[PDB]
Design an enzyme around this catalytic site. Structure first.
Site, PDB file in Angstrom:
ATOM      1  N   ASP B 346      88.196  60.166 123.511  1.00 45.71           N
ATOM      2  CA  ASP B 346      87.400  59.326 122.626  1.00 45.71           C
ATOM      3  C   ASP B 346      88.099  58.992 121.317  1.00 45.71           C
ATOM      4  OD1 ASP B 346      85.046  59.151 124.271  1.00 45.71           O
ATOM      5  OD2 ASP B 346      84.595  61.220 123.715  1.00 45.71           O
ATOM      6  N   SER B 371      89.264  57.019 116.001  1.00 43.33           N
ATOM      7  CA  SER B 371      88.128  57.757 116.534  1.00 43.33           C
ATOM      8  C   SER B 371      87.086  56.741 116.961  1.00 43.33           C
ATOM      9  CB  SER B 371      87.552  58.722 115.500  1.00 43.33           C
ATOM     10  OG  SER B 371      86.351  59.306 115.962  1.00 43.33           O
ATOM     11  N   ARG B 372      86.815  56.667 118.262  1.00 48.74           N
ATOM     12  CA  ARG B 372      85.889  55.665 118.768  1.00 48.74           C
ATOM     13  C   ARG B 372      84.432  56.008 118.494  1.00 48.74           C
ATOM     14  NH1 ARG B 372      87.827  52.204 122.742  1.00 48.74           N
ATOM     15  NH2 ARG B 372      85.703  52.225 123.601  1.00 48.74           N
ATOM     16  N   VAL B 373      84.142  57.218 118.023  1.00 46.55           N
ATOM     17  CA  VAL B 373      82.790  57.537 117.583  1.00 46.55           C
ATOM     18  C   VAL B 373      82.572  57.058 116.155  1.00 46.55           C
ATOM     19  CG1 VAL B 373      81.125  59.377 117.258  1.00 46.55           C
ATOM     20  CG2 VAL B 373      82.720  59.479 119.157  1.00 46.55           C
TER      21      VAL B 373
ATOM     22  N   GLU C 190      80.460  56.740 126.706  1.00 48.10           N
ATOM     23  CA  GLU C 190      80.289  55.320 126.430  1.00 48.10           C
ATOM     24  C   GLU C 190      79.386  54.649 127.454  1.00 48.10           C
ATOM     25  OE1 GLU C 190      83.716  53.267 125.314  1.00 48.10           O
ATOM     26  OE2 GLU C 190      84.546  54.945 124.167  1.00 48.10           O
TER      27      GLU C 190
END
Ligand SMILES: Nc1ncnc2c1ncn2[C@@H]1O[C@H](COP(=O)(O)OP(=O)(O)OP(=O)(O)O)[C@@H](O)[C@H]1O
Ligand SMILES: [Mg+2]
Lengths: 47, 517, 469, 122, 50
Positions: B346, B371-373, C190
């Site tokens: 992620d 950071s994809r969060v 996701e």
């Protein structure tokens, strides 16, 4: 004169970056292919 | 004194009650053996991934099954395998003991203690290949997992339930990043709150034994072994141990996650697990692919890293945070296993040797790290004072070519240059010294509020240090209400600004000059 | 009787032996049983090769841990079949057609085999056609093809899921169609995020989700695209409805094919991909097309390995792509939504023979102005704004106006703002940008151009901000 | 053989062993010369599939225990000046101090030709 | 090896010899040819393990 010379110099450097990146990616693919050829050649030699 | 007849009568307890009636077993025979693999004829009922018992307590795992034999991976003491020995069936797939008695221990990739402090009292057993939580069994990653590192916690925040890759060449500080993330949970453990405590699992795959000893010593000197387990597959262990170690470490810490607890797990050098699995699969003569990897190595890592989840409220709400470590070669993130693990996780933290030598430590490349969060894994105070930080550093990095011509730059350009130098000196941090989130909020407030434009760049660190020191001694109320309310309201900012000005008029630079505006 | 039995199990590859007259077809779906109660499940094997001597080599779609040699294998008589119909809308499935949010739903629907042929040659549309979405930037600078393929190069935090929701809304309202989302190699985090986001935006009732997740063997990650494509093909052919198919990371479909090929013992091609890479990408992309007045348009996220556009996987994928939409973070930080990079996007039907001469002229003028502004942006950022000329300033102000007018009040923002989205006809877009480049709006303040529709919305904004003419 | 002599000096006699090993890489190279003759599929760069595990079985014996010291020092050949080769890349993980010599420093006449930016210590 | 034997016979009699192996690369190519015709498993660049 310096402004124009540095503009053309940065353009030449950009084109050199592009050509070197193209050749480097070409080699990268070639190295992966040759390594796979060696691995599979050994694996077939054993079978 | 020592419990003497306690000893002798404990073992008399064991033997008198020795009952092992004659059960009917299904046996096979070793037909060949070499390099850690044994082929076993017979065993018609053995299933895939089943544990097999060779003579002498040796264990193997039935991987290849075909019409002639069963190709099994010997799990240690392979040099005692001979052609003609009898292989017994277990009837059980690989499982490990799980429980709270594993905190503070160092175990095999089988649940066996290797530190020598006695046996581990086990709550239950748990299979290694239990499925990951369903797509509907999950919940949005919303709580932060504080690493205590300003660069990570501000630029690439980590949530509870997120997979953050730590990827770097070598000697770049990845193990240090993860050990500091572990040490930072000490104060959350002291709080005694089960919704704030984070249990840690440190998987050591293929490392030198003294390296694992040093990591354990660092975690002990920081008091972090009250909530940390170490699953150690040293470099001397078999390839099966290095392949199984992260699955053992993930089977532990899934018991906890499903018990409504919050866990962090560090897979140190997943690359060595990938290479152990490649060794196993090549010795079993499975078709090799790119870089001779079996073809299910992506599955090998994604099956492991998808068990790190944030469970829904009807499953307890527990979580398992993953910190897989990948060691690149010459910063080639375009290799096979780096590509796989970058695809899986992620977010990534790219550590580089060039940044490490320039003094930027932790050597986290904040330009390519991600950071994809994101802001969902931050508190309000840090989300506020560090939302300014990313494009500050972008501007500084695209301006630092004009470092020798600041006289020729615009006002705003030179301003961005100086601010960027200050902010780069701000994200630097010593080793094994993690900071709580309130002190990080205060430091990044120093950075982005402009209260560092008066301090020389070669004095920022010390300045910040001393200021925090002062604030820890004199004005603890600011840090306290930041910690309690998770937000830096305007009045706390007023008091903080005044504290900064007073400390400034008290602070003395190294050139002798002033730091007062 | 007529059932087979397992012979070899080496990973996800299972060999099965059948009686002499009961050898299953290629791609047939067999059902084996794992009864070890810790891992008890029903393996769905897919026949891949006929090995002779009644042996077949199959790829298991579930992990084979706990499988015993000699267990009975039942033949279903067909390939992997997914449930089709309108009832598949608002639910999440996997590559096999099992409902994930409500297990057991769809078992009574009609089922379609995921291995189909593309439309016959006499049934293809010979003339290409533009898909008018209603977005100004897409309709002008990157005209999408109806029944064509669109690459989507949006990273993280650039509003890519918002653009997905936007296209869902537009195809469901401007075309009375539907949407199928194929998550190939989809992260479960996701996947759940997208599920709850579509449920909150109330566009789940318009979408069918098909997730082949990352913790699954390469078989399902390879077949999930065909599952979603079969659902979309039912919606187009049988329902008579324009479909929009989102294949997120087609590259993971390519990679799963490569992994399945390596597992089956095939010799690797160049770089390492499967020898049948182009044929797999072709059999997938040839079904996404226009047929008998109805259409399937696809928006596909593409990953470029090592940023090498000559790599076999993106070099093969791009042979089928018709347009490109690159979501920039620089444009996202300016508050311009959708954050489509105008100079870096492209489309193959931005050609006078398709869109018209005036459309082409206006688009080329806008691109020239934006590119010149991109040239001037660095000298502006280092030296300052009126270090420049006054011709340069005229261009910079015009370019700021144009760059801000490409944003829009998207239909996905209505849930946050309450005001409905816009749908600007392509003629009005051409007129508006022609007038913007001519200089007819160089006095209106810049904020008057953020997130508006046609020319009348711009006028109303200018009036509520005290300017006109 | 030499490691067994050193292990005897460490475990039984117990006094401050020094153990020099000139080109421990030849161990791995010899292991790779017979690997296919033993019937093993080759791994990435033509090395035996059991490279890391053989190296770990040998290197983990070259160690000091509690109270018993072995100062070990090994020369490690880097094939074709490539520090990404699997053999030195695997040997790297077994060491407390690595002095990395370079041919770019050798070409300048600087001796010892140590690369200061790559060499390390714990 | 023939040249080396001819030279070693002199070397072991107290004499000093100098032997020049012109293009050992050609010998390595010949040995690779032999080993590939005997179907011995190749290594890197199809060279034998030895
Ligand atoms: N924040 C830091 N500040 C100063 N020094 C550091 C920092 N982090 C790490 N180091 C130093 O860098 C060296 C390498 O660190 P570390 O062992 O964590 O890297 P690594 O990624 O584990 O490398 P490898 O796995 O190849 O050993 C250590 O000796 C440590 O002293
Ligand atoms: Mg380390």
């Amino acid at each position: 004169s310096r402004q124009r010379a540095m503009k053309s110099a940065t353009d030449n450097a950009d084109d050199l970056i592009k050509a070197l990146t193209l050749m480097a990616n070409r080699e990268r693919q070639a190295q992966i292919t040759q390594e796979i050829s060696e691995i599979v050649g050994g694996a077939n030699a054993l079978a | 004194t020592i419990p003497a007849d306690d000893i002798q009568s404990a073992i008399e307890e064991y033997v008198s009650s020795f009952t092992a009636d004659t059960s009917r077993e299904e046996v096979g025979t070793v037909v060949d053996a070499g390099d850690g693999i044994a082929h076993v004829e017979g065993l018609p009922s053995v299933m895939t991934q089943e544990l097999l018992e060779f003579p002498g307590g040796i264990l193997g795992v039935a991987l290849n099954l075909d019409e002639h034999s069963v190709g099994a991976v010997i799990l240690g003491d392979f040099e005692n395998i001979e052609e003609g020995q009898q292989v017994k069936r277990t009837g059980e797939v690989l499982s490990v003991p799980v429980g709270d008695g594993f905190l503070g221990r160092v175990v095999n990739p089988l649940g066996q203690p290797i530190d020598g402090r006695g046996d581990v009292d086990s709550d239950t057993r748990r299979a290694l290949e239990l499925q990951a939580p369903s797509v509907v069994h999950r919940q949005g990653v919303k709580e932060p997992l504080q690493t205590g590192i300003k660069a990570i916690d501000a630029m690439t925040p980590i949530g509870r339930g997120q997979r953050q890759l730590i990827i770097g060449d070598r000697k770049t500080g990845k193990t240090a990043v993860c050990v500091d993330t572990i040490l930072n949970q000490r104060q959350n453990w002291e709080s005694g709150d089960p919704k704030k405590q984070v249990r840690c699992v440190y998987v050591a795959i293929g490392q030198k034994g003294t390296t694992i000893a040093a990591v354990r010593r660092t975690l002990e000197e920081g008091g972090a072994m009250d909530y940390t387990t170490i699953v150690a597959a040293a470099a001397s262990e078999s390839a099966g141990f290095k392949w199984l170690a992260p699955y053992t470490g993930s089977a532990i810490a899934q018991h906890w996650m499903y018990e409504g607890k919050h866990v962090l797990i560090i897979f140190d050098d997943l690359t060595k697990q990938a290479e152990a699995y490649r060794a196993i699969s090549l010795l079993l003569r499975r078709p090799p692919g790119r870089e001779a990897y079996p073809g299910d190595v992506f599955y090998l890592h994604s099956r492991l890293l998808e068990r790190c989840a944030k469970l829904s409220d009807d499953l307890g709400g527990g979580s398992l945070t993953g910190l897989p470590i990948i060691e690149t070669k010459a910063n080639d993130i375009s290799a096979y296993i780096p590509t796989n693990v970058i695809s899986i996780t992620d977010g990534q933290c790219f550590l580089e040797t060039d940044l490490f030598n320039q003094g930027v430590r932790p050597a986290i490349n904040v330009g390519v790290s991600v950071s994809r969060v994101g802001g969902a894994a931050q508190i309000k105070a840090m989300k506020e004072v560090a939302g300014s930080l990313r494009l500050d550093l972008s501007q500084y990095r695209e301006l630092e070519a004009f470092a020798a011509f600041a006289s020729d730059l615009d006002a705003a350009s030179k301003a961005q240059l100086e601010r960027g130098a200050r902010l780069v000196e701000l994200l630097k941090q010593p080793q094994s010294q993690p900071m709580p989130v309130e002190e990080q909020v205060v430091s990044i407030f120093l950075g982005t509020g402009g209260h560092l434009d008066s301090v020389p760049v070669e004095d920022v660190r010390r300045f910040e240090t001393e200021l925090l020191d002062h604030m820890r001694a004199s004005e603890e109320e600011i840090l306290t209400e930041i910690r309690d309310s998770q937000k830096l309201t305007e009045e706390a900012a007023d008091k903080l600004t005044e504290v900064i000005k007073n400390f400034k008029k008290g602070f003395a630079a190294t050139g002798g000059g002033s730091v007062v505006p | 009787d007529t059932s087979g039995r397992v012979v070899r199990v080496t990973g996800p590859v299972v060999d099965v032996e059948f009686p002499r007259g009961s050898i299953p077809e290629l791609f047939n779906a067999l059902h084996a049983e794992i009864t070890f109660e810790s891992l008890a499940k029903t393996l769905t094997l897919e026949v891949a090769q006929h090995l002779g001597d009644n042996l077949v080599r199959t790829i298991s779609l579930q992990p084979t841990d706990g499988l015993v040699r000699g267990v009975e294998v039942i033949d279903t008589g067909r390939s992997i079949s997914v449930p089709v119909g309108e009832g598949v809308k608002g639910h999440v499935f996997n590559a096999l057609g099992d409902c994930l949010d409500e297990p057991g739903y769809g078992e009574k629907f009609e089922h379609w085999s995921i291995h189909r042929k593309p439309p016959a040659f006499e049934e293809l549309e010979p003339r290409t056609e533009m898909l008018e979405t209603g977005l100004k930037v897409v309709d002008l600078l990157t005209p999408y093809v109806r029944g064509g393929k669109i690459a989507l190069f949006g990273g993280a935090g650039v509003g890519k899921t918002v653009l997905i929701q936007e296209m869902i809304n537009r195809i469901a309202r401007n075309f009375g169609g539907t949407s199928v989302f194929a998550g190939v190699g989809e992260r479960t985090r996701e996947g759940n995020d997208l599920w709850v986001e579509l449920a909150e935006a109330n566009v789940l009732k318009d979408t069918a989700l098909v997730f082949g997740q990352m913790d699954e063997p390469p078989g399902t990650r390879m077949r999930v695209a065909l599952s979603a494509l079969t659902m979309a093909e039912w919606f187009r052919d049988e329902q008579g409805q324009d479909v929009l198919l989102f294949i997120d990371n087609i590259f993971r479909f390519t990679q799963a094919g490569s992994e399945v090929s390596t597992l089956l013992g095939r010799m690797p091609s160049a770089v390492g991909y499967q020898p049948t890479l182009a044929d797999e990408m072709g059999e997938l992309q040839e079904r996404i097309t226009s047929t008998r007045g109805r259409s399937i348009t696809s928006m596909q996220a593409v990953y470029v390995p090592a940023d090498d556009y000559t790599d076999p996987a993106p070099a093969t994928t791009f042979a089928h792509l018709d347009a490109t939409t690159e979501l920039s973070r620089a444009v996202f930080s300016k508050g311009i939504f959708p954050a489509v990079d105008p100079l870096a996007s492209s489309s193959t039907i931005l050609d006078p023979s398709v869109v018209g001469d005036e459309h082409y002229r206006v688009a080329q003028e806008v691109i020239r102005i934006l590119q010149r502004y991109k040239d001037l942006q660095d000298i502006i950022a280092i030296l300052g704004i009126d270090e420049l000329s006054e011709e340069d300033k005229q261009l910079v102000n015009r370019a700021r106006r144009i760059e801000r007018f490409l944003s829009q009040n998207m239909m996905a923002a209505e849930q946050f703002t309450g005001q409905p989205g816009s749908t600007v006809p392509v003629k009005e877009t051409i007129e508006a940008f022609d007038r913007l480049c001519k200089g007819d709006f160089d006095h209106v303040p810049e904020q008057a151009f953020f997130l508006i529709g046609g020319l009348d919305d711009l006028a109303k904004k200018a009036e509520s901000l005290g300017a006109k003419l």
